[PDB]
Amino acid sequence: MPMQMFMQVYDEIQMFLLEELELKFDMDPNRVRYLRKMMDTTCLGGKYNRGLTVIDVAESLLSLDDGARRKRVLHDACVCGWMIEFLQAHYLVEDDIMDNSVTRRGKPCWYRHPDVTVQCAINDGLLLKSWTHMMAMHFFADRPFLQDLLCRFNRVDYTTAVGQLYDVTSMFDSNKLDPDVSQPTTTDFAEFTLSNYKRIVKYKTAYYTYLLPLVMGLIVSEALPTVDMGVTEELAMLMGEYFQVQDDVMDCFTPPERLGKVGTDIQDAKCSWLAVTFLAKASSAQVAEFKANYGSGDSEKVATVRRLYEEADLQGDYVAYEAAVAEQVKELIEKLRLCSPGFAASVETLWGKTYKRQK
Amino acid sequence: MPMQMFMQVYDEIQMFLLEELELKFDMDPNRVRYLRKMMDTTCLGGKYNRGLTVIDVAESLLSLDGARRKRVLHDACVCGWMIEFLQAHYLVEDDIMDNSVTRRGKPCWYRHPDVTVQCAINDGLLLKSWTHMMAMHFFADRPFLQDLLCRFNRVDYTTAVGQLYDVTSMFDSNKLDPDVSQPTTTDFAEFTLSNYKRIVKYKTAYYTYLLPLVMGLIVSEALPTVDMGVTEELAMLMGEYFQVQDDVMDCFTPPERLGKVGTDIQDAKCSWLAVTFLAKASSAQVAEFKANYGSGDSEKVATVRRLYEEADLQGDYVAYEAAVAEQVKELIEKLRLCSPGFAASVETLWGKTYKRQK
Numbered sequence: 086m087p088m089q090m091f092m093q094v095y096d097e098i099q100m101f102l103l104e105e106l107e108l109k110f111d112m113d114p115n116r117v118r119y120l121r122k123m124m125d126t127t128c129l130g131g132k133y134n135r136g137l138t139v140i141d142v143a144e145s146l147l148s149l150d151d152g153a154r155r156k157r158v159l160h161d162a163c164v165c166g167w168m169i170e171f172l173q174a175h176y177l178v179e180d181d182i183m184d185n186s187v188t189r190r191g192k193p194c195w196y197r198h199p200d201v202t203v204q205c206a207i208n209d210g211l212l213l214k215s216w217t218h219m220m221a222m223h224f225f226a227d228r229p230f231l232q233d234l235l236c237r238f239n240r241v242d243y244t245t246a247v248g249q250l251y252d253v254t255s256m257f258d259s260n261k262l263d264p265d266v267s268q269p270t271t272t273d274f275a276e277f278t279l280s281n282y283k284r285i286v287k288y289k290t291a292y293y294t295y296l297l298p299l300v301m302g303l304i305v306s307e308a309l310p311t312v313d314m315g316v317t318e319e320l321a322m323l324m325g326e327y328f329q330v331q332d333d334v335m336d337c338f339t340p341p342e343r344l345g346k347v348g349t350d351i352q353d354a355k356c357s358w359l360a361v362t363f364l365a366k367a368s369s370a371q372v373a374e375f376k377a378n379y380g381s382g383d384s385e386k387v388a389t390v391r392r393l394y395e396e397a398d399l400q401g402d403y404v405a406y407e408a409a410v411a412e413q414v415k416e417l418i419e420k421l422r423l424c425s426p427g428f429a430a431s432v433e434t435l436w437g438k439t440y441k442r443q444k
Numbered sequence: 445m446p447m448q449m450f451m452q453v454y455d456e457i458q459m460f461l462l463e464e465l466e467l468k469f470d471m472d473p474n475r476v477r478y479l480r481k482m483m484d485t486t487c488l489g490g491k492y493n494r495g496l497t498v499i500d501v502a503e504s505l506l507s508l509d510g511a512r513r514k515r516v517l518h519d520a521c522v523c524g525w526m527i528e529f530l531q532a533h534y535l536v537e538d539d540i541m542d543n544s545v546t547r548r549g550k551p552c553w554y555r556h557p558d559v560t561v562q563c564a565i566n567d568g569l570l571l572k573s574w575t576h577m578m579a580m581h582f583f584a585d586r587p588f589l590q591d592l593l594c595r596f597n598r599v600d601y602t603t604a605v606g607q608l609y610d611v612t613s614m615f616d617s618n619k620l621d622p623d624v625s626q627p628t629t630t631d632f633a634e635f636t637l638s639n640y641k642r643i644v645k646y647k648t649a650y651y652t653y654l655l656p657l658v659m660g661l662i663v664s665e666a667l668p669t670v671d672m673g674v675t676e677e678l679a680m681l682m683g684e685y686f687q688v689q690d691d692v693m694d695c696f697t698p699p700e701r702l703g704k705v706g707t708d709i710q711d712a713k714c715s716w717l718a719v720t721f722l723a724k725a726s727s728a729q730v731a732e733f734k735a736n737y738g739s740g741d742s743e744k745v746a747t748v749r750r751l752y753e754e755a756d757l758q759g760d761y762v763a764y765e766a767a768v769a770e771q772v773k774e775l776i777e778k779l780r781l782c783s784p785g786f787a788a789s790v791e792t793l794w795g796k797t798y799k800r801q802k
């Protein structure tokens with residue numbers, strides 16, 4: 086039922102967008118066709134956890150009529166959800182190019198589609214981000230919360246890009262970070278710290294994936310200040326670290342057929358939670374071997390790293406992390422429940438879609 | 445001296461942005477230092493035609509204390525930097541997309557020795573995000589904020605649509621199908637003046653010409669005072685002409701006054717020369733062109749160039765420039781009538797544009 090409406094508003098947004106191109110940007114049928122397929126492939130097919138969370142938070146918070154408010158709040162909530170989903174899609178397009186990924190949810194990455202050029206794809210991602218602004222101005226022009234909704238959505242958008250910078254520079258010794266001088270992979274790996282990993286992940290995932298759907302849902306239902314923000318943020322940061330940690334773990338141990346891609350972070354020499362947790366507990370013998378084998382397509386060198394990760398019980402460390410998170414999450418949600426029982430419950434519902442996710 | 449304050453506010457903008465990163469986004473001196481270089485390299489060293497035009501429009505309009513002047517002109521330099529940062533964002537992405545080698549005589553951002561393409565794509569995105577950040581900082585209490593950012597974004601969006609037109613313009617559009625490959629078009633039935641006009645209008649004209657005038661107007665609190673249909677006609681014609689000039693220079697300006705060796709031939713770009721050549725050419729000429737366009741072999745590239753040379757494209761260009769100058773003159777008068785002050789600032793903008801050497 087949340088799914089049924091979400092999906093109608095998708096059609097609504099697409100129609101306004103594609104038509105506005107036809108009417109005011111002199112676009113031809115062919116490019117409109119190009120763009121409708123780009124939009125569908127890039128924005129549809131996922132679980133819509135971010136987008137659906139807005140609707141769910143908005144519904145929860147209604148309690149504070151023909152049902153005319155209800156109809157308007159829930160429709161705004163779907164628009165907002167699509168804003169966050171189109172933001173994800175923009176990033177996905179750019180991130181797959183940047184991470185030189187091959188597939189995503191069983192389909193070739195967008196820039197790997199037979200008829201999509203690498204150059205057109207960069208600009209396709211840019212289109213996605215702009216559509217967020219376009220749809221928002223179309224639906225919300227006469228909303229009092231406009232300026233505040235967009236101010237936060239743009240801060241979150243920026244935080245995610247800062248996060249991407251962290252991620253994409255966490256393999257070179259930062260003291261040697263310099264545009265005007267060539268530089269290779271950190272052969273010492275001394276920056277692969279839990280501390281630095283938590284920073285990468287807070288900024289690249291947690292803000293847009295966990296804080297923004299909560300905050301947007303609150304805004305459209307006009308309940309932003311009914312909620313302890315500090316505790317809400319603690320939650321989002323914590324749920325968002327765990328999610329990313331899950332992404333990292335699944336990237337190594339989850340079979341392609343369930344992951345939607347032949348996972349590569351090892352290959353990519355990525356600063357993952359597995360890398361860093363391994364490096365901190367690991368012996369000198371283990372560490373040298375790992376250094377000898379991380380960041381290489383060779384099937385046996387990446388399977389060495391996998392044996393090492395197993396040897397060192399990273400799977401059990403994960404069970405231990407997940408358990409700490411769950412209790413930290415339980416305690417925070419109850420502090421929320423005191424004054425925000427409707428909201429705590431929608432966060433619960435978000436935690437449910439996250440904790441031990443199959444994805 | 446408009447340049448002097450323009451650079452002062454750049455520092456202010458910079459200082460707020462980098463300090464917000466260390467204070468609120470847990471950044472370290474190394475990445476901050478990387479981001480200061482990136483911001484400098486990509487945002488400075490140009491002519492600042494877009495940015496300075498905002499200031500000039502706002503100066504031309506503060507008659508219709510003597511310290512509202514101070515505030516309106518400070519607003520106007522922020523706006524100018526929003527538009528230059530917007531440019532810079534697109535140059536970062538465009539040079540990767542267009543696979544270019546230098547810009548203004550340095551290696552393009554993504555060719556810098558220790559910048560990856562991977563990181564440069566995201567650098568581009570940082571640029572765009574900064575336009576929003578700087579604006580919320582200086583303008584949050586300013587009542588024109590919603591209108592300013594609304595149009596700014598519309599122009600951003602039009603620039604990106606134009607880039608789509610540019611980048612899909614060497615393939616037959618009937619066959620645009622994400623799921624099937626298709627090589628460069630062998631018939632160029634769509635290198636037309638028509639299609640050229642559309643690329644250029646959206647990708648250049650709006651952010652380069654309209655947006656600087658529009659933002660100057662908004663911080664002057666004088667937008668409804670001008671004939672927008674006319675202002676728009678002007679920006680579109682002025683913008684088309686500029687890009688025509690960009691295309692011609694790409695082929696005929698010697699790398700060193702240009703600041704790069706040109707890419708439009710080898711990319712098989714729908715340039716103004718390509719479409720103006722194709723429209724007047726014999727069939728022999730068309731076949732020779734067809735055997736040589738979208739190629740890096742340097743004597744095919746000087747064949748193509750000699751085809752253009754020997755089809756008199758400079759007389760065609762001189763006649764276009766004259767017909768553009770003439771229509772510019774007319775439109776500036778229709779606008780001078782009710783908006784005397786604004787016309788002048790549009791005329792100064794045209795003066796920075798008409799037969800530009802730099």
Ligand SMILES: Cc1cccnc1NC(P(=O)(O)O)P(=O)(O)O
Pocket residue numbers: 176177180181184186245289290332
């Ligand atoms: C697409 C994206 C946005 C923000 C954070 N991560 C993202 N991608 C993930 P992917 O979905 O695993 O590519 P990664 O960070 O592992 O490349």
Ligand SMILES: Cc1cccnc1NC(P(=O)(O)O)P(=O)(O)O
Pocket residue numbers: 534535538539542544647648690
């Ligand atoms: C960067 C850019 C933005 C808008 C229009 N043109 C741009 N670049 C130009 P360049 O500056 O000539 O690369 P082109 O259109 O020829 O690639």
Ligand SMILES: [Mg+2]
Pocket residue numbers: 180184252
């Ligand atoms: Mg990534």
Ligand SMILES: [Mg+2]
Pocket residue numbers: 180181184186
């Ligand atoms: Mg990726």
Ligand SMILES: [Mg+2]
Pocket residue numbers: 332333336350
């Ligand atoms: Mg991953």
Ligand SMILES: [Mg+2]
Pocket residue numbers: 538542610
């Ligand atoms: Mg280009």
Ligand SMILES: [Mg+2]
Pocket residue numbers: 538539542544
């Ligand atoms: Mg270029």
Ligand SMILES: [Mg+2]
Pocket residue numbers: 690691694708
């Ligand atoms: Mg050019």
